[PDB]
Amino acid sequence: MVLSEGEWQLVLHVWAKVEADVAGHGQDILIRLFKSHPETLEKFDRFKHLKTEAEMKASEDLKKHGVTVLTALGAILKKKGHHEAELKPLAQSHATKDKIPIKYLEFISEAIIHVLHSRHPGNFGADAQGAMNKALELFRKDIAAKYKELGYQG
């Protein structure tokens, strides 16, 4: 009732390429986020001490968090819009535990698209970029609704 079947299949086709190397893609995506929007780094008490790109690449903890982030997102994408159960705990941990504005989810969405385009251009042309953009838009709209339900405006 938001993406068409064909759009979902484009999303899952490129996501399969991510799955070939989750740790690498995860690392790349978090570094791209922090490099482009340094203010996001302040939300992470465990990585705030990291001062250069090399130190980031070498950090076991950052790489582990990358896998955690992408595992969770992939589980959501594979639901093709039917992600209520999976989305609710994610909203709670980003709305009460830690307070992550919708703006910053926008920033990490841009980082994901940047990295997919950098690594898989042959499989991420305009139609695929559009489909992925839509799926990340849907993720953001629905987590924003859950944010509000919990008392956080986002």
Binding site for ligand HEM (CB under 6 A): 40, 43-44, 46, 68-69, 72-73, 90, 93-94, 97-98, 100, 104-105, 108
Q: How far is the CB of 44 from ligand HEM (least distance, A)?
A: 5
Burial annotation 92-119 (CB, 10 A radius, 16+ → b, else e): eebbeeeebbeebbebbbbbbbebbbeb
Nearer to ligand HEM, 5 or 129 (CB): 129
- CA angle 96/39/77 to nearest 5° reads 60
Q: Is 114 part of any known ligand binding site?
A: no
Please tell me the distance from the alpha carbon of residue 17 to that of residue 12, in angstroms, as a whole number.
9
Cβ distance to ligand HEM smaller for residue 10 or 143:
143
What is the nearest approach in angstroms of ligand HEM to the Cβ of residue 35? 13
Is 65 annotated for ligand binding? Answer: yes
